[PDB]
Amino acid sequence: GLFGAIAGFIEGGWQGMVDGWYGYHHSNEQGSGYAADKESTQKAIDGVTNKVNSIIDKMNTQFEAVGREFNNLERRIENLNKQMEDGFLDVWTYNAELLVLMENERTLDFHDSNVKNLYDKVRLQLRDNAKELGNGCFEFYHKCDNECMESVKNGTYDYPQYSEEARLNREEI
Amino acid sequence: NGQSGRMEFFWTILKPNDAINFESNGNFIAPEYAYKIVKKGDSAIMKSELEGNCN
Numbered sequence: 500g501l502f503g504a505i506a507g508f509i510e511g512g513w514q515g516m517v518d519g520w521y522g523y524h525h526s527n528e529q530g531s532g533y534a535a536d537k538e539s540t541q542k543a544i545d546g547v548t549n550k551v552n553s554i555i556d557k558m559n560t561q562f563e564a565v566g567r568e569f570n571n572l573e574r575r576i577e578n579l580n581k582q583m584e585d586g587f588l589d590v591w592t593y594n595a596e597l598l599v600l601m602e603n604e605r606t607l608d609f610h611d612s613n614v615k616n617l618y619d620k621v622r623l624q625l626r627d628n629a630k631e632l633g634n635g636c637f638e639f640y641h642k643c644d645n646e647c648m649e650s651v652k653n654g655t656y657d658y659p660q661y662s663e664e665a666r667l668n669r670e671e672i
Numbered sequence: 673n674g675q676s677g678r679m680e681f682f683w684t685i686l687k688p689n690d691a692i693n694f695e696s697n698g699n700f701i702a703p704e705y706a707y708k709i710v711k712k713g714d715s716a717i718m719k720s721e722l723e724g725n726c727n
């Protein structure tokens with residue numbers, strides 16, 4: 500997609516993460532498991548929901564066809580009336596079809612963007628304290644227990660706390 | 673329908689304190705019953721071939 504994440508550098512989604520759209524899979528000594536990023540997921544849910552509600556809202560002043568009758572010597576205005584009705588019906592059908600097509604495309608890229616931002620959120624925290632595997636995964640240069648995993652997930656990673664043990668592990672490599 | 677003569681019908685709306693005056697010496701098809709427009713609202717004449725006890 501537009502942002503290179505979904506079906507991009509992260510080649511595939513996880514059947515395993517089920518409590519959200521975007522999230523993490525960690526793996527340490529205490530064990531592994533999936534977890535959804537509640538914040539970025541809720542943001543996306545709010546965005547998509549407002550989008551859906553905005554599309555349905557913008558359409559309340561749409562054209563509504565009315566039955567009208569005409570006789571054999573009113574064929575002209577009968578036809579005018581028909582062209583007018585079909586005219587608006589065709590316009591509004593275009594508007595609904597196009598709006599859905601356009602916002603669908605933006606929605607898929609929106610998810611792609613939320614993911615790429617989530618990856619960057621972690622990356623910008625870890626810096627040289629971890630290695631970019633290049634598949635959405637970061638291999639740590641230090642010990643990351645469950646509480647450390649939780650700090651990366653909630654944006655409270657204390658980079659300098661692990662800075663030294665990371666640096667030492669980088670340099671024997 | 674067997675008939676070779678024709679009848680031509682007319683209508684008008686008679687406003688609440690107005691009066692309608694007929695004068696004729698023949699060929700007159702006279703009103704007996706008229707219709708009070710009791711409720712004006714938004715309605716329609718739907719052209720359909722169907723006739724359902726539902727809502």
Ligand SMILES: *[C@@H]1O[C@H](CO)[C@@H](O[C@@H]2O[C@H](CO)[C@@H](O)[C@H](O)[C@H]2NC(C)=O)[C@H](O)[C@H]1NC(C)=O
Pocket residue numbers: 689690691
């Ligand atoms: C239809 O009937 C009414 C009532 O008999 C007429 O209204 C009266 O009009 C006069 C003036 O011409 C007023 O001073 C009265 O008080 C009215 N009466 C009522 C009960 O409203 C009315 O003008 C008649 N219309 C026609 C076209 O003959």
